[PDB]
Amino acid sequence: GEEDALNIKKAAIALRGDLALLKANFEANELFFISEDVIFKTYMSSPELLLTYMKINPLDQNTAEQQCGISDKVLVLYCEGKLKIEQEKQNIRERLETSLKAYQSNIGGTASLITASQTLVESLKNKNFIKGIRKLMLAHNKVFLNYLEELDALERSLEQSKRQYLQERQSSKIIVKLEH
């Protein structure tokens, strides 16, 4: 009763938090996948488009001469292209790792809470349905028993009516004898 409804309330709210966290993780991934697919269809789709992109969007002058200080300007593009790929792999690893960690942080509690709350809800529905059948049978039993009691009462009233009739009859016979 009180306990079961209270346990359903605690579990529901904890479970809502868990699912909200799992969902935000999935959604953050989907948002990343949309922007990242674009990249893979454009400047990360071939060495040619990467090199073209790196000519227009160079890396900072600092890192440039720092990492790819090369005489041949074409080789600089290749070098910067490689660094751009390496930075992207790191970006992707970090997001993957964040996703794994966020999922792992909530999945156990989620699976447990789902199982417990759904079983508790189901338990209460079954009990209530079975209880409703038994309650209806009890009510039918009372109706039958009430008829038997109404018949016992009627029988006692009939018997009392008969004893009164006999007193009236006795009286009637006395009177008619007197009127003769």
Added chain:
Amino acid sequence: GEEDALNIKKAAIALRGDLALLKANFEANELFFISEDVIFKTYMSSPELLLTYMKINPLDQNTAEQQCGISDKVLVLYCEGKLKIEQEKQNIRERLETSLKAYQSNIGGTASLITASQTLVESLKNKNFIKGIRKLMLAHNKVFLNYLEELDALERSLEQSKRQYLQERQSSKIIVKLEH
């Protein structure tokens, strides 16, 4: 899988039979209660209306002189009235007993089958929901891993493009030297 869906099918059909039997018992009671309430509002509602009814609707000539062979014709009405009440109590006892027996014949199997089938259905819903979450996480993991693999491939293509560029450069320098 196969077993669970087969057990759900066997239990459903047995349970449908059980509930159909319980219901027919309740309905047969309700039908009786409707006609019987009428009786209790009319000729079984008072000794007066019972006696009036028994004058118009006498018991068979056989049982009459057999049970209530009485000189006083009014006393015959009382006697027949009592027998009519006794027959009604028996009618009601027999129906009550039939109801109890029919309910008792099915209630145990019903309560058990409800609990088992509902728990099995609930178990399959929870498993499927949890499985759907894990499957989506797996799919997200594959997307991330596929990006890493597309980046490794792009990097190898970039490196091959660079080795070709260097062969073209080597060739270009040889040619320009010759054109001098």
